[PDB]
Structure 1
Amino acid sequence: DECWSVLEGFRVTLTSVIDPSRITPYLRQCKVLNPDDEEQVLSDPNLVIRKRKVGVLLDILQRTGHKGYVAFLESLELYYPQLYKKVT
């Protein structure tokens, strides 16, 4: 691992800003997630504030390592450039 245990250093910022409906497909084509986990992220009558969703998604990525990390990171510097800069 060695990467998530540090990126997590700041998580409130992400959980507040980022949104899933854009990140999901690019990841999907970089072959990380499966359909089921996506539908669990999005359609669920229990978690609604939009923040629990990001929490679940970010944890599902943490369960995977370097690969999913790179996918997430590249997606991020492609969509949210100033946030990527803040990360680095």
Structure 2
Amino acid sequence: GSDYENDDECWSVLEGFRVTLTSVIDPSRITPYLRQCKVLNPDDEEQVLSDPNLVIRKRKVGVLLDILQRTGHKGYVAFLESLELYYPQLYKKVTGKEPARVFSMIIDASGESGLTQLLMTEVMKLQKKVQDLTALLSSKDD
């Protein structure tokens, strides 16, 4: 079957890629989204955000996988929820195929209006990010 089971061993497809996941991904951006999926506890995001910066990001994602696997297949798909939104190429490599978009986890967990609020604020951050980049683009250090 296609991963329909619910167990911690589900992570096998992500684990052999954690070498890249720890050096590329920053839990400091994805941990509030993992709250919406109801897999990540408030204690988990606190202990990972013990450093608010991206200094210890290598050990952050490493312990974060070990955190989300405590909920089994739940934390697996939840990591994919945050991943397909924030790191799409990281999903493409861990699975070997295109973004599936199994966002029915966060839909069931936080609600359709929950994910609508998430995406709606993310497009405002991105609308802000466009003017943020063209501001520094118009005046560089060359």
- Range of TM-score over shorter length: 0.7 to 0.9
Between the two proteins, what is the percent identity of the paired residues?
A: 100
Contact conserved, 2:23 with 2:58, CA < 8 A, in 1? yes
Name the stretch that deviates more: 46-55 or 19-28.
46-55
TM-score normalised according to structure 1 size: 0.82
Which stretch has the larger CA shift, 24-33 or 49-58?
49-58
Superposed displacement of residue 11, structure 1: 1.4
1:17 maps to 2:24: yes
Structure 1 74/44 Cα, relative in aligned 2: closer, same or farther at 3 Å?
closer
How many Å apart are 1:6 and its aligned residue?
Answer: 3.4
Distance 1:4 1:35, change over 3 A: same
Q: Could you tell which deviates more after superposition, 1-10 or 70-79?
A: 1-10
Gaps of 5+ in 2: 1-7, 96-142
Give the whole-Å Cα distance in 2 for the aligned partners of 1:74 and 1:56.
Answer: 18
SS of match in other structure, 1:3: helix
The whole-number CA distance in structure 1 between the counterparts of 2:52 and 2:80 is 29
Structure 2 length normalisation: TM-score?
0.54
Q: What do the CA deviations read for 1:36-76 (whole angstroms, capped 9, x no partner)? A: 22111111699953211221111101222111111111211
Q: Distance in 1 between matches of 2:78 and 2:53?
A: 28
Q: Aligned-pair RMSD on alpha carbons?
A: 2.6
Structure 1 residues 33, 82: closer, same or farther in 2, change over 3 A? same
Contact 2:11 2:69 in 1 (8 A): yes
Bigger RCO of structures 1 and 2 (CA < 8 A, at least 6 apart): 1
CA contact (8 A) 2:25 2:57 kept: no
Count of residue pairs the alignment pairs up:
88
Alpha-carbon separation, structure 1, partners of 2:71 and 2:27 = 18
The structure that has the greater radius of gyration is 2
Q: What residue is the counterpart of 1:32 in the other structure?
A: 39
